[PDB]
Amino acid sequence: ALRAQFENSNEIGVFSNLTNSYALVALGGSENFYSVFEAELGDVVPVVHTTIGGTRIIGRLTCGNRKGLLVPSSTTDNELQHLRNSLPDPVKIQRVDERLSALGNIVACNDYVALVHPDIERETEEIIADVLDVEVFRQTVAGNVLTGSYCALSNQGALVHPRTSIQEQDELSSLLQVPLVAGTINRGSDVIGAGLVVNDWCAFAGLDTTATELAVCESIFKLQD
Amino acid sequence: PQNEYIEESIRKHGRRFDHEERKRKKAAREAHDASLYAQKTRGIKAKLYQEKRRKEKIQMKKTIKQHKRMITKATFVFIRPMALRQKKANVTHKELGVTMQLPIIGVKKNPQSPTYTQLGVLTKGTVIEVNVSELKYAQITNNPELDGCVNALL
Amino acid sequence: TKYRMTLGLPVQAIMNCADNSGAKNLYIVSVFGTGARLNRLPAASCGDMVLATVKKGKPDLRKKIMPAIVVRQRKAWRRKDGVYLYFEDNAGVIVNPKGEMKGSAITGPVAKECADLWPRIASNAGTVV
Amino acid sequence: HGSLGFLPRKRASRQRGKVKAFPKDDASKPVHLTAFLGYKAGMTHIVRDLDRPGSKMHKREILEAVTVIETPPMVVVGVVGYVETPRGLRSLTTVWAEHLSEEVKRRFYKNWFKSKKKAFTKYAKKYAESTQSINRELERIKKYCSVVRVLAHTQIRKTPLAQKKAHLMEIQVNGGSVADKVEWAREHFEKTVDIKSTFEQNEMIDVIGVTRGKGNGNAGYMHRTQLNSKIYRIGAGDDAKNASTDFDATEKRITPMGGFVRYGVVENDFVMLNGATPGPVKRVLTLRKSLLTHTSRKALEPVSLKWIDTASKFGHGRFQTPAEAKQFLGTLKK
Amino acid sequence: TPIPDVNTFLDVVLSRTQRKTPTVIRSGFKISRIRGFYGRKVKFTQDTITEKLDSILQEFPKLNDIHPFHADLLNILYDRDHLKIALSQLSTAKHLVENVARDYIRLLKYGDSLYRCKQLKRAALGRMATIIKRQKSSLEFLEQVRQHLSRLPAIDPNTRTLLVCGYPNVGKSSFMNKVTRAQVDVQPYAFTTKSLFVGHFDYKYLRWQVIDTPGITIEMQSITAMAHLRSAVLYFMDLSEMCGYSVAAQVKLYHSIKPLFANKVTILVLNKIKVVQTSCVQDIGVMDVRTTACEALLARPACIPDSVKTLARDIEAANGGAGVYNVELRDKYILQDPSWKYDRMPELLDGKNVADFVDPEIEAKLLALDEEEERLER
Amino acid sequence: RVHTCYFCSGPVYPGHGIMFVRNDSKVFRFCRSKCHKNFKMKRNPRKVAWTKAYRKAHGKENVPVRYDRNVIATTLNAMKRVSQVHAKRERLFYKKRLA
RNA sequence: GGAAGAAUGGGCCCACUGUCCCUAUCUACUAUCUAGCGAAACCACAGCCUGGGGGGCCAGGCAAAAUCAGCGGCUUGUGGCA
RNA sequence: UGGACCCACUAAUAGGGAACGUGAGCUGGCCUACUGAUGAAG
RNA sequence: AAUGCCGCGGAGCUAUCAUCUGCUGGAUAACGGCUGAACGCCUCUAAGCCAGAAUCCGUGCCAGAAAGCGACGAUU
RNA sequence: AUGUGGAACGGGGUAUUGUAAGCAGCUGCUGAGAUUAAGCCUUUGUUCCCAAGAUUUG
């Protein structure tokens, strides 16, 4: 687990997207964040510096996995062409034209199990299942439609809002087939997805995240070893 | 930091290398600077320089030697304003040499005019009777209309 | 930061709240960070922090001079790409000075200028258009 | 009220912009020009990548309004000599060329046709008779004078303008010794100097001209000089591939469909300027290399155009060229 | 706020009054205008004095309102009773000045002539100056109090803390200096640490405040702090008696100080070797003692890559630095041909989005379409 | 990329026109002011003679790919050939419509 | 935007509006010119400003005809008495 | 500075004068200037 | 139908409702110093010098003397 | 004051409105018709105009 901040904000998840095989970074911002990502997992997985739709909210607006990556249809075709050039050939990128523009904030996807907002269109869910090659379940996290932003998903564990019930958390963990912990990061911030990003082997959290929260996240994700 | 935090940094790191000769240099050339002060400045800050220079000059000389129908004046109880009315006077005893704020029991006579004496107007030189039990007529040695206080001598 | 963008929400205006916090209608009082201009009422627009009072909603929340961020605008303003944008109504969010909203969701599309400027607003956004 | 400095608000005494300030000479530098004078035709808008380092809009797409100024190559017709004196710059003498362009002769005459065209006739013969006298004057210029300006005029024939009078003006020749400037002026007699000589598709130029007139204090028709105003492109309309942005290809010409409003069709060398310029359409403008030396990033960055718009400025046009228009529209009876 | 001298404060107040209010009043104006001018100057003088007094009162805290540890230390190290007396004297002086100003303003309300106003204006200033001059020692005490308060630390008894007290120079300060990043100077002279030193420390993801205490005014301050503090005692007894105090003397001192050590975890540190032996000379066991004291006070597999199992900022800084460095996206591309990666592409031609209508299969489709078109034409 | 007008159904170049988004996350681009007002008044494009929708339905008419030099070069020539072939069919269609 | 200075008006509220932000545009007339006709008040003499004794005086600054159009005229920061 | 001593922004919302400030800019309890437009003449 | 009513309406006008642009050299005050007497020391000062304020004066920006002037073309 | 001259018209291009009247059989003519510079662009289009009158100038 590495703690860092983008510009002057520790909300790394909004400004960057981390997958199990690729990393998404913003363009025109602080070069230190790109250097930190390159030093952490650049030599292991690719890190692409590009903006979707000309914005630095690519992390909080785009959703994807190691198998496939989904971007909003509003993204420029020129941006899509650059993404394919940067991304490896085995990485699948598909444009999603759905009633929900924020793919990342609405749906959080893991390498095997994905949970999406109940309002997602059937065609988008079929496209997401076809692209990510994972099971997609339309449910809610802590009674919030923005499951992809208020909750964090990872292969070795999951993070949920601290207000989630134990029975609901147990049901979600059983459904996701992975351990789940309900809590807050970035010193009590309830946007776990916006405030934390964890990969299969590495995790990147905000620079202002509490040590106890960082220790809890490392144990939950088994990133200590 | 804690306690006299700059007093162990000096203890552990040392002093500004060139502070002492700078302060020695400042303590020397200030003599020329002081004279240049009086030859350039003007106004109140120059006036404030003047008497403060002489104050320490004479003090130094001492140590080396040792080496509408209304009342326009304050009254005691036309129209006499309540604010202008006064009942306490800081009359100073002559033999005792102690100034005490005594109540104005009454006014004996006002030298300005008998009408002022009838009105009990407090004026300089007017005779006023004040109780001396805690210690009698007394003459006002000041003008309360300008001084703002009933200053008198027993 | 944020570039020059058309201001069309002057003081003494009623503006609609689009979160689940229970607030419905918002009354503008003053605009943060306004210059000392002569005879020019400060205005508001998407992504701008202003002082507003909840006209209707939860009684405890209202009667408080609190910062508000506008997220929707009727007026047509130019985006730096060269296209003009306008929305069906004026919508804002209930937010503390730190930059956190009491509510936990937003309704309808969200201007990317508001979303990019305030990262947690984008976190709460589900439709950014 | 407005600025106190720009007072009085009286109408300009010059129809065409006059360059009062010129870049400082440097003999170490080679001989080069400093000022240009073209014609403002109109404006369009272009699409361009914005490669501004450190900005939030870094390495992405931005739209910028541009102005189109036709700049046909001038004809150098003469040189003048200037002497630095305790009373300022004084004109020592002036030498010209032999075959003056006929538009220049229109400048000297208010009623050309009625006149017997007697301008410079005896000067022409005395040059052909004895070039020694001219050589002596050029000897005077190269020896005594300190600031040298060449006489240049707009060649208005190839422009689509009703006016037939050439706008004559002087351009400083900065660089080299005095004799070097005169020799450069001599070898450039009677020939043409292109716009590409002075500006290089990315340079720091100051546009000068007389602003338009709003009618009656006076409101409009004053002399003005805008600073900054970076160049975006120096086109060459003589090439049929003049606009032809590399990103879009889309074979086209700078002239908007139906021609520039109240100007016509631009055919010759033209310059693209960001923002706006003083003065209305079909008016002569004057450009000059920026006086100061600033390496601000907004003045040093390179520019590679993405796409320019050649739509119909007349009305709400929506078509770039008839080649791309015809197949979209259904085949009409004509 | 800083505490100025009595003479300096009067001059600053007088200068500020003259600089802000006008000082040019011709005698030919109305009596009310002269009366208004004199009153405004007096009112400004009263306001400036009132603002200074209020700022002093606001800056001065309340001993009762302070925490029990802070108040006891303040009383011991600053004579809170004397400080309270001085503050009340200043408050009484401020009230007396306000009453005098109100009386002067009321007298000025019935002004008659310019000389009467001028005499009244001088009289008010002189009375205020005498009151300010009389309140001279209070300023000196306040300045000393401010300096002592500024040097004083911020006690946080709510958080976890470790109090080290006992015989002077028994190595407790050295252990505290080693445990926490705070470094308090130690000298061979006894009672070198006149004031307590607090050093933050981290242990088991918890913040511990290592606070040293004077060996046993300094002893009284150390006792008062230990009296009201949620911290564990760290009584260090010199086993080798190298601190100058005998083992029996240290034990007797620890027994006497046990009333303050009650309701807390007591650690018996055998210096210069809970009873913990710590070799002060050998600097051994300090970490173990600190740890003991801290303890006493208290199907989705992860596809980890082989590279994971087994900088950009520097590059940008070296070339042009931040804000002057342009990163080219062509380099960070997986294009097979390096020339193709560094070259541009056709975006839109002839009114058609070519980039949106060009596919890899078009290489063979175009040839097939050309053959199909020829067949259709034929 | 030049978008297609919602009402006018024509090419929309960057800069001109306006963009209108809806509550259902549907964004409509208007080619010109008249087209924007036409969509403002909810005029049916199939009921508008000057709209390509009526012209069509009245008898009157996502995965990015890796770039290749050869593919790009042939794409431009094919587009020109496609336009030439398509234009001829319309001329025949217009002749049939007139006849 | 909607009282921050037309609506139909309705029941403090609601609606409404260039009152305002912040003015912009248009039309008509007046204004303007040309032709003709054609006054009266008013008038010691006139008419550039600073300073000194106002426009006329003294010492300065300046100073180019004829005209058209909008349009002005001593006092300060320190109380008194013994 | 915006609003009825106040309550917020802002970097601050400094003090005055034009002796009856500007009541012949403002309200309540001919000629000479200035701005512009032409202009005969060495 | 004194511009009957309504929709759109180019060109013009205008929009801090739309866009563009808004410098760079010297001499200074406070002040920091250097050399250095007066005054065999010392001393920013006396003779001198260096640095230094959104300050001052120029550079640029506009007007161009209608009684300032120049180069040049023709000259019944 | 005889010319890639000028002008009036007209053609083409460009544009606004919305598909005319009429022929007809909603549809076809017909994405037509009308207007298009009076402060748009161009003119191998037809026409006439002109190598002119007066005033002051060493």
Please report which residue ranges of chain F form alpha helices under DSSP H.
33-40, 52-56, 69-98
Distance between CA B111 and CA A52 in Å, rounded? 99
Method: cryo-EM
Residue corresponding to tokens 């607030």 = C23
Residues E20 and E139 in one domain: yes
Q: Which residues of F16-42 are buried (b: 16+ CB within 10 A; e: fewer)?
A: bbbbbbeeebebbbbbbeebbebbeee
Q: Cα distance from D133 to chain E (closest Cα, Å)?
A: 58
Number of separate domains in chain A:
1
Q: Which nucleotide is nearest to E20 (CA to C1')?
A: H15
E171 assigned binding-site residue: yes
Distance between CA B80 and CA B69 in Å, rounded? 9
Q: Which chains sit next to C, with 3 or more Cβ pairs under 8 A?
A: A, D, F
CA D13 / C1′ G32 distance in Å: 26
Cα–Cα nearest to A72, from A80, A64, A82, A62: A62
Residues E182 and E201 in one domain: yes
Cα–Cα nearest to B112, from B153, B72, B70: B72
| Residue B120: both structure tokens together | 């009990």
E169 assigned binding-site residue: yes
Distance between CA D86 and CA E362 in Å, rounded? 77
Distance between CA A117 and CA B129 in Å, rounded? 97
Domain end point (choices E298, E329, E362): E298
On whether any CB of chain A is under 8 Å from the CB of E29, the answer is no
The domain of A109 spans 1-225
Contacts of C80 in chain D (CB under 8 A): 57, 62-63
Residues E27 and E130 in one domain: yes
E258 assigned binding-site residue: no
Distance between CA B140 and CA B148 in Å, rounded? 13
Asked if A140 contacts A180 with a C-beta cutoff of 8 angstroms, the reply is no
Contact (CB<8Å) B145/E116: yes
Distance between CA D255 and CA D319 in Å, rounded? 13
Residues E202 and E94 in one domain: no
Candidate from A80, A97, A101 with C-beta closest to F64: A80
The answer to whether E and A touch (≥3 CB pairs < 8 Å) is yes
Contact (CB<8Å) C81/D62: yes
Distances (CA, A) of E308 to A157, A202, A225, B91, E351: 19, 8, 12, 96, 48
| Residue A211: both structure tokens together | 């040590």
Candidate from E120, E182, E185 with C-beta closest to B11: E185
Contacts of B5 in chain E (CB under 8 A): 151
Residues E137 and E56 in one domain: yes
Residues E172 and E114 in one domain: no
Say whether the CB atom of D133 is under 7 angstroms from strand H.
no
Rounded to the nearest 10°, the torsion over CA F91, F94, F98, F99 is 70
On whether any CB of chain E is under 8 Å from the CB of D250, the answer is yes
Q: Cα distance from C38 to chain F (closest Cα, Å)?
A: 33
Contact (CB<8Å) B148/E124: yes
Domain end point (choices E151, E186, E208): E151
Q: Which amino acid would we find at residue D189? A: F
Has residue E332 been placed in a domain? no
On whether any CB of chain F is under 8 Å from the CB of D190, the answer is no
Has residue E294 been placed in a domain? yes
Give D38's Cβ-side CA count (13 Å radius): 30
Q: Cα distance from D318 to chain C (closest Cα, Å)?
A: 15
Q: Which of D47, D49, D59 to mutate to test the interface with A (most CBs of A within 10 A)?
A: D59
Residues E108 and E168 in one domain: no
Say whether the CB atom of E301 is under 7 angstroms from strand H.
no
Distances (CA, A) of E342 to A31, C125, D206: 22, 37, 34
Asked if F34 contacts F18 with a C-beta cutoff of 8 angstroms, the reply is no
Has residue E281 been placed in a domain? yes
Distance between CA A217 and CA A154 in Å, rounded? 11
On whether any CB of chain A is under 8 Å from the CB of F23, the answer is no
Asked if E342 contacts E332 with a C-beta cutoff of 8 angstroms, the reply is no
Candidate from A83, A95, A101 with C-beta closest to F62: A95
Q: Which nucleotide is nearest to E23 (CA to C1')?
A: G76
Q: Which residues contact E62 (CB under 8 A, 6 or more apart)?
A: none
Helix (H) or strand (E) holding D139: helix D131-144
Q: Which residues contact A157 (CB under 8 A, 6 or more apart)?
A: A178, A179, A180, A181, A198, A220, A221, A222
Give D91's Cβ-side CA count (13 Å radius): 8
Has residue E292 been placed in a domain? yes
On whether any CB of chain E is under 8 Å from the CB of D328, the answer is yes
Residues E15 and E113 in one domain: yes
The domain of E51 spans 6-151
Candidate from D59, D249, D323 with C-beta closest to E346: D249
Long-range contacts of F90-95 (CB under 8 A, 24+ apart): F90/D327, F90/D330, F90/D331, F91/D331, F93/F61, F94/D330, F94/D331
Distances (CA, A) of E186 to B15, E168, E170: 20, 10, 11
Asked if D38 contacts D70 with a C-beta cutoff of 8 angstroms, the reply is yes
Return the number of other C-beta atoms located less than 10 Å from residue D291's C-beta: 14
DSSP 8-state class, residue C106: B
Has residue E350 been placed in a domain? no
Cα–Cα nearest to A93, from E235, E19, F64: F64
Residues E11 and E136 in one domain: yes
Asked if E230 contacts E158 with a C-beta cutoff of 8 angstroms, the reply is yes
Q: Cα distance from C62 to chain D (closest Cα, Å)?
A: 37
Has residue E271 been placed in a domain? yes
Distance between CA B61 and CA D86 in Å, rounded? 66
Domain end point (choices E282, E298, E314): E298
Contact (CB<8Å) E335/A85: yes
CA D9 / C1′ G48 distance in Å: 24
Asked if E40 contacts E124 with a C-beta cutoff of 8 angstroms, the reply is no
Distances (CA, A) of E173 to C103, E179, E276, E286: 52, 10, 16, 11
Q: Which residues of D35-66 are buried (b: 16+ CB within 10 A; e: fewer)?
A: bbbbbbbbbbbbbbebbbbbbbbbbbbbbbeb
On whether any CB of chain D is under 8 Å from the CB of E321, the answer is no
Strands (E), B1-58: none
On whether any CB of chain E is under 8 Å from the CB of D57, the answer is no
Return the number of other C-beta atoms located less than 10 Å from residue F56's C-beta: 13
The CATH number of the domain where E203 resides is what? Answer: 3.40.50.300
| Greatest extent of chain A over all pairs of C-alpha atoms, in Å | 46
Cα–Cα nearest to B122, from B73, B78, B79: B73
Asked if B139 contacts B125 with a C-beta cutoff of 8 angstroms, the reply is yes
E36 assigned binding-site residue: no
Give D185's Cβ-side CA count (13 Å radius): 33
Cα–Cα nearest to C93, from C26, C28, C5, C11: C26
What are the φ/ψ torsions at residue A217 (nearest 5 degrees)? Answer: -65, -40
Residues E205 and E127 in one domain: no
Distance between CA D91 and CA E311 in Å, rounded? 63
| Greatest extent of chain B over all pairs of C-alpha atoms, in Å | 83
Has residue E318 been placed in a domain? no
Q: Cα distance from C26 to chain A (closest Cα, Å)?
A: 24
Contacts of A28 in chain D (CB under 8 A): 54-60
Candidate from C81, C84, C129 with C-beta closest to F25: C129
In three state form, how does the secondary structure of chain E look?
A: CCCCCHHHHHHHHHHHHHHHCCCCCCCCCCHHHHHHHHHHHHHHHHHHHHHHHHHHHHHCCCCCCCCHHHHHHHHHHHCHHHHHHHHHHHHHHHHHHHHHHHHHHHHHHCCCCHHHHHHHHHHHHHHHHHHHHHCCHHHHHHHHHHHHHHHCCCCCCCCCEEEECECCCCCHHHHHHHHCCCCCCCCCCCCCCCCCCEEEEEECCEEEEEEECCCCCHHHHHHHHHHCCCEEECCEEECCCCCCCCHHHHHHHHHHCHHHHCCCCECEEEECCCEEEEECCCCECHHHHHHHHHHHHCCCCCCCCHHHHCCHHHHHHHHCCCCCCCCCCCCCCCCCCHHHHHCCCCCCECCECHHHCCCCCHHHHHHHHHHHHHHHHC
At residue D132, the 3 state secondary structure works out as helix
Residues E183 and E125 in one domain: no
Contacts of B84 in chain E (CB under 8 A): 107, 110
Distance between CA D203 and CA D290 in Å, rounded? 9
Candidate from E334, E335, E354 with C-beta closest to F79: E354
CA B11 / C1′ H29 distance in Å: 73
Return the number of other C-beta atoms located less than 10 Å from residue F87's C-beta: 12
Asked if A205 contacts A195 with a C-beta cutoff of 8 angstroms, the reply is yes
Say whether the CB atom of E22 is under 7 angstroms from strand H.
yes
Distance between CA D38 and CA D171 in Å, rounded? 13
Distance between CA C16 and CA C107 in Å, rounded? 11
Residues E271 and E176 in one domain: yes
Q: Which chains sit next to F, with 3 or more Cβ pairs under 8 A?
A: A, C, D, E
The CATH number of the domain where E25 resides is what? Answer: 1.20.120.1190
Cα–Cα nearest to B107, from B95, B115, B97: B115
β pairing state of C66-70 and F3-4: unpaired
Q: Which nucleotide is nearest to E28 (CA to C1')?
A: H19
Q: A87: exposed, middle or buried (C-beta count within 10 Å: 0-12, 13-18, 19+)? A: buried
Has residue E369 been placed in a domain? no
| Number of cross-chain residue pairs from E and F with Cβ atoms under 8 Å apart | 65
Distance between CA D23 and CA D35 in Å, rounded? 10
